[PDB]
Amino acid sequence: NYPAEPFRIKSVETVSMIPRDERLKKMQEAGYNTFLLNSKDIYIDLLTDSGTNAMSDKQWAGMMMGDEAYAGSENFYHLERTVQELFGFKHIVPTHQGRGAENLLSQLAIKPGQYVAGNMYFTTTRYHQEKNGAVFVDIVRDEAHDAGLNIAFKGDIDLKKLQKLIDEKGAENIAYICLAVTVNLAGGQPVSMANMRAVRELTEAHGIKVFYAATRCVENAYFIKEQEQGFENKSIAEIVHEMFSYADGCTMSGKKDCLVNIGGFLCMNDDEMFSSAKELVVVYEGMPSYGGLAGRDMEAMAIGLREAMQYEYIEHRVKQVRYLGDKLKAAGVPIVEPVGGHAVFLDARRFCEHLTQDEFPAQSLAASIYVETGVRSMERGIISAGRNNVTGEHHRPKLETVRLTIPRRVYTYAHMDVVADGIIKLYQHKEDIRGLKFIYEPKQLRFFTARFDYI
Amino acid sequence: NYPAEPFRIKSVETVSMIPRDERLKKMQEAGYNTFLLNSKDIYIDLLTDSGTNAMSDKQWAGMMMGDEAYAGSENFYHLERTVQELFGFKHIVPTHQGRGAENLLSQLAIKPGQYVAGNMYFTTTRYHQEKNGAVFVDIVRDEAHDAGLNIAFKGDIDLKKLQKLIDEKGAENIAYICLAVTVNLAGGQPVSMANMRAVRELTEAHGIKVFYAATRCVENAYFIKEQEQGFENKSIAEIVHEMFSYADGCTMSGKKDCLVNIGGFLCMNDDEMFSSAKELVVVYEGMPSYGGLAGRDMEAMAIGLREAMQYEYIEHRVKQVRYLGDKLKAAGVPIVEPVGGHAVFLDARRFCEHLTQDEFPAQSLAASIYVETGVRSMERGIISAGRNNVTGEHHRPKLETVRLTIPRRVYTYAHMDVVADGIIKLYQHKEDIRGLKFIYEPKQLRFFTARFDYI
Amino acid sequence: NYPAEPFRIKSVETVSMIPRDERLKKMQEAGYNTFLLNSKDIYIDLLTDSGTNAMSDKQWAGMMMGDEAYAGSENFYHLERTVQELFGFKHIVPTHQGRGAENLLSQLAIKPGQYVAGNMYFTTTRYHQEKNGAVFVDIVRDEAHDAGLNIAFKGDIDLKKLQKLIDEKGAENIAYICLAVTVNLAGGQPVSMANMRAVRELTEAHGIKVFYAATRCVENAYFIKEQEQGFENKSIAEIVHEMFSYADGCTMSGKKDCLVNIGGFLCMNDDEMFSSAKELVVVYEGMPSYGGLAGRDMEAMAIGLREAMQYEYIEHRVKQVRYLGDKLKAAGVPIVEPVGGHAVFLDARRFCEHLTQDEFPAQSLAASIYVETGVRSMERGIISAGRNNVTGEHHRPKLETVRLTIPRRVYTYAHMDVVADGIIKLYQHKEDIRGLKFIYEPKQLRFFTARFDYI
Amino acid sequence: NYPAEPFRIKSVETVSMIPRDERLKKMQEAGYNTFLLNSKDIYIDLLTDSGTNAMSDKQWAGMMMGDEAYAGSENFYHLERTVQELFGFKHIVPTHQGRGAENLLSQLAIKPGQYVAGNMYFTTTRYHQEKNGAVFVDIVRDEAHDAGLNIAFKGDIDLKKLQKLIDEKGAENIAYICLAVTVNLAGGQPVSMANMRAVRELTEAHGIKVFYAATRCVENAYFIKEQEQGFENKSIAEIVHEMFSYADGCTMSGKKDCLVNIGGFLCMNDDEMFSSAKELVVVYEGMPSYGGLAGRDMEAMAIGLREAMQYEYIEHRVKQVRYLGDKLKAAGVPIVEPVGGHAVFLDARRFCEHLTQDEFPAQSLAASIYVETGVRSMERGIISAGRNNVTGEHHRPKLETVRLTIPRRVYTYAHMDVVADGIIKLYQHKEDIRGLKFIYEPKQLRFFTARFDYI
Ligand SMILES: *Cc1c(COP(=O)(O)O)cnc(C)c1O
Ligand SMILES: *Cc1c(COP(=O)(O)O)cnc(C)c1O
Ligand SMILES: *Cc1c(COP(=O)(O)O)cnc(C)c1O
Ligand SMILES: *Cc1c(COP(=O)(O)O)cnc(C)c1O
Numbered sequence A, B, C, D: 001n002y003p004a005e006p007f008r009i010k011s012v013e014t015v016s017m018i019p020r021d022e023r024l025k026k027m028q029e030a031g032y033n034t035f036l037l038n039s040k041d042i043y044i045d046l047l048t049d050s051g052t053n054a055m056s057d058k059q060w061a062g063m064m065m066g067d068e069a070y071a072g073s074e075n076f077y078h079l080e081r082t083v084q085e086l087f088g089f090k091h092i093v094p095t096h097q098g099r100g101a102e103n104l105l106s107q108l109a110i111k112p113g114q115y116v117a118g119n120m121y122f123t124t125t126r127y128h129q130e131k132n133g134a135v136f137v138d139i140v141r142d143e144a145h146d147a148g149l150n151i152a153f154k155g156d157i158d159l160k161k162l163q164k165l166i167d168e169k170g171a172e173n174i175a176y177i178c179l180a181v182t183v184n185l186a187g188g189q190p191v192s193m194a195n196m197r198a199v200r201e202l203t204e205a206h207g208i209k210v211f212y213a214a215t216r217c218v219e220n221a222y223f224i225k226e227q228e229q230g231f232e233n234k235s236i237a238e239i240v241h242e243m244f245s246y247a248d249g250c251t252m253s254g255k256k257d258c259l260v261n262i263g264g265f266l267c268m269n270d271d272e273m274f275s276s277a278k279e280l281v282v283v284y285e286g287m288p289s290y291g292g293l294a295g296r297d298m299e300a301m302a303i304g305l306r307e308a309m310q311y312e313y314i315e316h317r318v319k320q321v322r323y324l325g326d327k328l329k330a331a332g333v334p335i336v337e338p339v340g341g342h343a344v345f346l347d348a349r350r351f352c353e354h355l356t357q358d359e360f361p362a363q364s365l366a367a368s369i370y371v372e373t374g375v376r377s378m379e380r381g382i383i384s385a386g387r388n389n390v391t392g393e394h395h396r397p398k399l400e401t402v403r404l405t406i407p408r409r410v411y412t413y414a415h416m417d418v419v420a421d422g423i424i425k426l427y428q429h430k431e432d433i434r435g436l437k438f439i440y441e442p443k444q445l446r447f448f449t450a451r452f453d454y455i
């Protein structure tokens, strides 16, 4: 049901076990914003699963063999051949992380006035697309926008919406389809192989490109393995390779499913696009032979991507997240459903139904969680959504959530219990959670440095 | 009652997740002796807690700062001042591990024909003592020999036995008292501060020296803090320092409670002893300034000893072992009680009541455990006890046990569940466990390479 | 005049010691382009000093203490306070390397149609400037363009050129002065404190901002200490701090003078600029708290920058490069003069007077060097200058050089002898060096993958 | 003539570049005993070549893959098969370093009253032999005792002396021949393959065992390669394998020619001796599967022994030592000749001919060297020889030397120049070097902690 860790602990990270009264003082000095907390003051840090992973002994051995050459590094060649073998693409261009690849992709594939259609969007990626003159069109299935609906493969593209876009704007006016795995804005929801294939088939008929934003493609492959009929005798590597056989290229954040602390890459099949990518990469990242990465990180990412294909590893990764969500759900705590590959999202609108969205229920719940347990979580609600600079009004997102984001191979089920038990205890007296108000609000990037006090 | 790990995972060790049928084949190739298994074939290796610990990030940082100089190394100065501060002895001599320190002590403190008395013995230490012409006398309380008996501080010395020795032999004929913390042969049982005090008082009145075999002294300090009334307001460090204030020196295995993979030391207060120690260490270990250790290992051990003093670390260490024993006990599995600081010992006599000791129930239980779970454990019974050289018969120890020895900071509670669940399942069909017989018996060190088959 | 290395070797990098005949075959497989050689096939790799530095034991210890948190990392706090202390700017924004910082600066400080004036340019930086709609104006002193001329502080700005710009265009039409230390295109030539002061005085009177492209600022500080009268009693740190006191901010490549393999940052004093910078960094690099770097790399760079301030380190760094140039000069080998902080540039025009620039003397000299010595160097001539897109003709740069670029702390004087002796032997038979012609020319970034054969 | 380093520097060790006046104060605080200096205060530490070597990137990768299992570690298996392949022995028993192997060997191979004959002796080894009741007989050729005689293979055994021993005491009374490579007491002098073979042939005829004390066997193999006719087409590995084909076993210090900071082993062919060794190793070192070493050190030593076979590495190692000796000799500085594989010995009796041996010319010269250059060297003269405890008189050795002992891969030719130039300058005013007298003399191990002041 829940497997034990399919690894041993090789080394540990020292933590301060500061008690409740001291955590409250830290939380106050941070202005009740978990983004302002010092890492040294946090027991369990679930701010993000990006770049926070534990590497293996084998990756650390790789880190000692960094070949730091500007061109022709053995580490580059190892990353290159690993990604060619596992993802099946012709050309690989390393980037320092995922958004560096997206910056390149947008410049390579978008003419101004064109549409980019995808299964929801990621803030930075959408910025790059719009900066290049594209209009983003969301073609995810309707169910994805219903955070309570417990159904499989909620990340799937609605083929009818894609069909309508093609009919209305013309294929030649579509830059590409951006297919994300898993889908962030729906809570880490997977995409079925059936959907990927149907998308390939429709787009190919019209000459439209498909590029994958593949940041959690291994979590995705695990869901296919577990839940899509016909995949029960297939290895994770076999599923991953098939997934990408339905794309023209991809952007990858090594920092997520490649089990590293930094790293990414851009893949493609097209020789002309590759030629062009080589010129752009130099401008923003570095030579095509390192792409803004140390040789030791190309090595660590080549090693980690291969480790990610081990069935027992990814099964455990996803079931650990699931354990946390199952324990919360069994106690009545409201969460986004189904639980995603990388995180559990608390529904803070429902958890704190006595608070208005203007009193920042997600921000306040995240503060309470830290004070009660030493666990840091991320506000993913009204604060992060930011203000409308035209009107001065909050953007008021339908999702008012606290994200419990789980780094790979860092925490145990007992840490998941610390998280769950603390949240369950807060839920039992949820009416006591106080609202927040700004005492300092930056004009930009307000989630990162805003400060609050209790109402 | 079971705390979460008070640390995060920094790096992981890759393990083979081989299935049962393949484990059976490995166990057979190892002639059903867990000592012959390949490390690469083992999921959870509970052969020993000695030298198998996960280091922290801070120790690994120290490992990069190895000052490898033959004399005057910063790492030696760091180790020296750390031991002086935390153990309180005037002089420190590094050794490659504990038995190197015991080798020196035996040569420095024993005249031919004297007695060494202690709370049970460690095999290699008794060897050194006798090689220097001492007779060993066991002065442990009788309860220590009763595996099933659940009493606190089972490792305590019987002061009446001590008194009897003094009266029968004379004080001038006792080289020293060797007080071990914790006590191996009783299953990792602790010694109280009251006993250490009373032993010191009686010996000092007679001019008899006391040396500690301090290999799990921090586990011991934890039992004092948790269970000895009057110690509830003391830090682990205050307890450790007080323990050593009742001794003239110690031998230490850093491989156990200093959280390293290699290292030990000898401490004393006496200047003349220290001078003679310097001459001896050179011949067996290395110069007094490194003692058969790399500079980086003196550094790791200096760091590790200070980390061991953190309450939450040692509370978790001991309660994790306790969890494994509690879960086994709740299912009716016979174990040595109370659970020790470092291991749970299955009582194979009671587990396999249908087998005679001559059929090697501990060896066979250890084999079945590996086959069912991927867990390696150590035979600590008739096989390890070896053969009588005069009579040709087995030494037949009273305790016939399988030792589930827990490395520090390597495993989680979910690993403990893997161990417990597999042993509980075996216990539910205990009658099916088959006796073993030798098919190859070496003349010396037989537990290491002997091979068996089922009767 | 040449000091010994002010450090010891902690660890070594394994290299191939392949003989001449095998090097010839590698060079041929690389189509006589050193950019295509495999790192594993190179004994001494002088392609670049960027990112190829040997770190110390103390940096590697810092690498073990990577605090990988998305915000609030101890490593970010260490980098931030180190830069504030040593460079003296209010605000620091990490970037994955220098061109990431330049990308942000160009977007923050340039309005369409303004001029950026500087002492020559770096290709990628000029690209960003022009992409933001600036026209670049070179205000370097004329001597900087005269490769053979041996004068001090060749990188200095011509203040009369600056004055002319201000009078012809108006101050409101100058976005900023970009002052580079040291100056790449003049061969690593330094800028005096007097010039930095005079530039600041003139610009400040007109309300024009100054930003430093500070990639080899510590090499530059060394030239000031050694050669600018009045600086003989100042530490390298005092010099660096004073240099930056004449600027409104900087872009930094830690990959050069901060002694690391990856990393950079952007600094500024202005609060509004810092706020806008935070929004931009997120889209291109990462959160302002890591900027596209692992925590361990922020830590290494923080450590490396402080190590760079040690006089003996930077004295040795620069005098080791000088030794290679002095030895070449003493044999009559034509080089750019004075020798720069980081590289010796062979003047391939003078080396191969029997070849026309259209026969690619620098490319061919670089090839022969590898074949004769196992040493890789970079073509910095007509090939790297690329092709005119309008006319289809080569850009024909005045300087046609081979760059012998020296990574910090990687090589010894005996390696420099290997380099010099092989080049002196080639020079003794310079007439034998054959012209090259393309057999494959890419349309973009041609120096990276172009292939040649002998005419 | 002198090759460049056949490696690059991967990482560096930070040094204090304290000037002359500060070094003098340090030297004073150390009581003019270089053994008392702090490592942090030394620029170039030539105290010993034992355990001070720089490891490769590949060895450091190995260090990250330590398999710390008590038995069946992959690292043990790698060391085992590497030594079997390269040295040709059947059985390998790791030990923490060389003297641990010697302790075992003496107990395994000596009956009381027997003779051990060798080519000179090593202090700790002779202690082990005598402790087991053997009498040591020196059978080195006469020339070895003439430190000025410039001849090849000065370490050779005199077959006539071995013949005489056999005739006089009987073969059955000879425990074994201990053949050392290279020979320490003669200044690091090699043994020819011809001599090894002649020794094997004579001993085999009489049934006498031969064991090699093989600590610098790779330096030895390089001398055979360079100077013994018939070995010019043989690889270093081929010579090493042949050397050991003439022994029954060996003791090895990894700390010298295996390029590690700790580690050693005992080898043998005999099954019964191996069985016995297994019992003893447990008592003094650890299980036969780790022998007092961390798994990562067995791995580092397995890797390093293989790296030591590279021709260019060992050629450079030996020629660097030679460069130092050649430079000294060319200036008239008196040294032991020929220069050995690992060190240059200054003849301090000749260097300081105005001082009596009672004024400690070697100790004083070593102090002067440190003050003038920051270089630490070892006294190998009257101080180290110690006192006769029966008579109270100094042992007065024929060799009164300062040992300039060179760690492998740590220093450059420029460091060798710092050493040489300083010594050459001291030589030019040698009459000014003052004698020393004790102000504090320990009863034991006096070289390690004695303190002096100037006469
Ligand atoms: C994380 C993510 C990115 C950005 O990658 P980074 O490595 O964080 O820059 C882009 N797209 C998706 C779908 C992501 O999940
Ligand atoms: C482990 C132990 C030893 C031996 O120490 P090592 O480090 O294994 O050599 C000696 N005495 C006791 C009581 C021990 O626990
Ligand atoms: C190296 C350099 C850059 C680019 O920095 P990277 O770290 O290579 O991106 C920009 N400007 C100057 C003056 C440089 O020297
Ligand atoms: C160094 C040496 C030893 C001792 O080895 P360690 O590893 O220092 O204990 C023994 N014999 C010879 C000939 C040596 O050179």
Ligand SMILES: [K+]
Pocket (backbone or CB within 6 Å): A050, A051, A052, A261, A262, C068, C069, C293, C294, C295
């Ligand atoms: K990170």
Ligand SMILES: [K+]
Pocket (backbone or CB within 6 Å): B050, B051, B052, B261, B262, D068, D069, D293, D294, D295
């Ligand atoms: K170990």
Ligand SMILES: [K+]
Pocket (backbone or CB within 6 Å): A068, A069, A293, A294, A295, C050, C051, C052, C261, C262
């Ligand atoms: K690099």
Ligand SMILES: [K+]
Pocket (backbone or CB within 6 Å): B068, B069, B293, B294, B295, D050, D051, D052, D261, D262
């Ligand atoms: K050492």
